[PDB]
């Protein structure tokens, strides 16, 4: 009889307890110790961008626009498709300077196309010198120009007023990239076109894109005073395209295919790794299983929602006693 007297076993209770639990905040209190908890925010990156689910095209010091126009340092980008275009911060142009009003507008819509299928288109070009070459723009250790343009100069000593057109007979919409030259001095105006004044009127059945080539002196980039202004027009399958010129025209050599797609564009400098992940950030690719993130606010694909909060604990257990302190 060891003092029990066969009375009771007391049928007491217990609970799971961990002496190294975590702090979880809630409505009632922000300093509640919980036995176990998990984090809903992924604050880490692998430092590399993977391309197993989506095709990624490396920038290789070439942005989207100069790839569209075709600098000689971006020759490998002809007829390539992408699901996401990355641009390096060290990108530069080795050819003539190009400018465009609403630069982000042309950058956005060409990126949404997701392709660069360019088809050469036949034209008349009678009485006008074609295949313009330029010294400061060097391709293959030789003088050249943009791949997708065609600088037009006078033939002999005359520049007839060009009235040319190219109807569209296909289902897919056409995209044209045509530029207008702005010479530095009037001496270059006479030497290259043999006509002082000029203007361009381009009109379709739905829109007009006429522009005047104002002449003036600019600060020199690679020892030239001239600048090139780029404009774009989009032709529906119904209507046609009409080009009228009397000087200072850089006509395109064809049309760009445009189509709806899932492509986008972002700026990053991280290298490319080999893994499987559906989310891409400028920091690097991250797992997408967590519902929230704080790595970056630039997203593409199935990336989680951006939350300013750093830590968001979710309770998976119960209240834990302080242990041996009662």
């Amino acid at each position: 009889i060891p003092g029990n007297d066969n009375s009771t076993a007391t049928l007491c209770l217990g609970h799971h307890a961990v002496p190294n639990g975590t702090i979880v905040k809630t409505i009632c209190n922000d300093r509640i110790e919980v036995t176990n908890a998990t984090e809903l925010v992924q604050n880490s990156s692998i430092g590399e961008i993977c391309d197993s689910p989506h095709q990624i095209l490396d920038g290789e010091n070439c942005t989207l626009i100069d790839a569209l126009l075709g600098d000689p340092q971006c020759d490998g980008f002809q007829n390539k498709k992408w699901d996401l275009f990355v641009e390096r911060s060290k990108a530069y142009s080795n050819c003539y300077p190009y400018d465009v009003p609403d630069y982000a507008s042309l950058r956005s819509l060409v990126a949404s196309s997701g392709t660069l299928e360019f088809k050469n288109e036949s034209f008349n070009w009678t009485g006008v010198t074609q295949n313009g070459t330029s010294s400061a723009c060097i391709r293959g250790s030789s003088s050249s120009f943009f791949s997708r343009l065609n600088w037009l100069t006078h033939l002999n000593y005359t520049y007839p007023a060009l009235n040319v057109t190219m109807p569209n007979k296909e289902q897919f919409d056409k995209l044209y990239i045509w530029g207008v030259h702005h010479p530095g001095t009037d001496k270059d105006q006479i030497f290259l076109y043999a006509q002082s004044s000029g203007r361009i009127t381009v009109s379709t059945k739905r829109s007009q894109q006429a522009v005047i080539p104002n002449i003036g002196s600019r600060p020199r980039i690679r020892d030239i005073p001239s600048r090139i202004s780029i404009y774009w027009t989009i032709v529906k399958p119904g209507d046609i395209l009409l080009i009228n010129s009397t000087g200072n025209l850089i006509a395109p050599r064809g049309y760009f295919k445009i189509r709806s797609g899932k492509s986008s564009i972002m700026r990053s400098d991280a290298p490319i790794g080999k893994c499987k992940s559906e989310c891409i950030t400028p920091n690097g690719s991250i797992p997408n299983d967590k519902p929230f993130q704080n790595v970056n606010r630039i997203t593409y694909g199935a990336c989680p929602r951006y939350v300013k909060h750093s830590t968001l604990k979710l309770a998976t257990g119960m209240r834990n006693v302080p242990e041996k302190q009662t």
């Binding site: 029990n4 066969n6 009375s7 009771t8 076993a9 007391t10 049928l11 007491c12 209770l13 217990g14 609970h15 799971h16 307890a17 961990v18 002496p19 979880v24 905040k25 809630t26 409505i27 009632c28 509640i32 919980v34 809903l40 982000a104 956005s108 949404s112 899932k262 492509s263 986008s264 700026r267 559906e278 299983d289 967590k290 519902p291 929230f292 606010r297 630039i298 997203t299 593409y300 694909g301 199935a302 990336c303 989680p304 929602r305 951006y306 939350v307 300013k308 909060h309 968001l312 604990k313 979710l314 309770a315 998976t316 257990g317 119960m318 209240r319 006693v321 242990e323 041996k324 009662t326």
Partner: protein, 172 residues
């Protein structure tokens, strides 16, 4: 709603019994015994998996978001894109703080009621053959051994055979 579980009828319970989150501890004449109720634990596990599956694996896919970084100053357009960028994140950040605040409170209150449900279910099976001590222990007031444990839970309990024992011991 807490129901005075942690600060009440627990009194700094043991850290052991890692087999299950809830169980029973008894000290009979033979010794000590432990048994974890697997049915009550599985009820709380299905709740947590229901909460997690709501958020994980159900992400939304977006493709062509606007530009959210400008290296140069621009006019009315830049101040509009930056503003809708800022007010979107602030709504989600307040939403994320509101989400985890209610779920954590709901999880704690449900687990406390689960212990109360087991506390209620045990005392229902005992008509007058039990007496609560006030800290999580039940006075048996009758003779018991290991045959109690298999019979008390799995739908094979009889109370009339042990009714006569408690009347003599409790009141005399």
């Amino acid at each position: 709603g807490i129901f005075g579980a942690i600060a009440g009828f627990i009194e700094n319970g043991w850290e052991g019994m890692v087999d299950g989150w809830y169980g029973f501890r008894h000290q009979n004449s033979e010794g000590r015994g432990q048994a974890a109720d697997l049915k009550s634990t599985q009820a709380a596990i299905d709740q947590i998996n229901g909460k997690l599956n709501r958020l994980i694996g159900k992400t939304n896919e977006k493709f062509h978001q606007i530009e959210k970084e400008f290296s140069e100053v621009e006019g009315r357009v830049q101040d509009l894109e930056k503003y809708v960028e800022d007010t979107k994140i602030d709504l989600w950040s307040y939403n994320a703080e509101l989400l985890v605040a209610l779920e954590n409170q709901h999880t704690i209150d449900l687990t406390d009621s689960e212990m109360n449900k087991l506390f209620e279910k045990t005392k229902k099976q005992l008509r007058e053959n039990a007496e609560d001590m006030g800290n999580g222990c039940f006075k048996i007031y009758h003779k018991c051994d290991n045959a109690c444990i298999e019979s008390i839970r799995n739908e094979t309990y009889d109370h009339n055979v042990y009714r006569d024992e408690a009347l003599n011991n409790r009141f005399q």
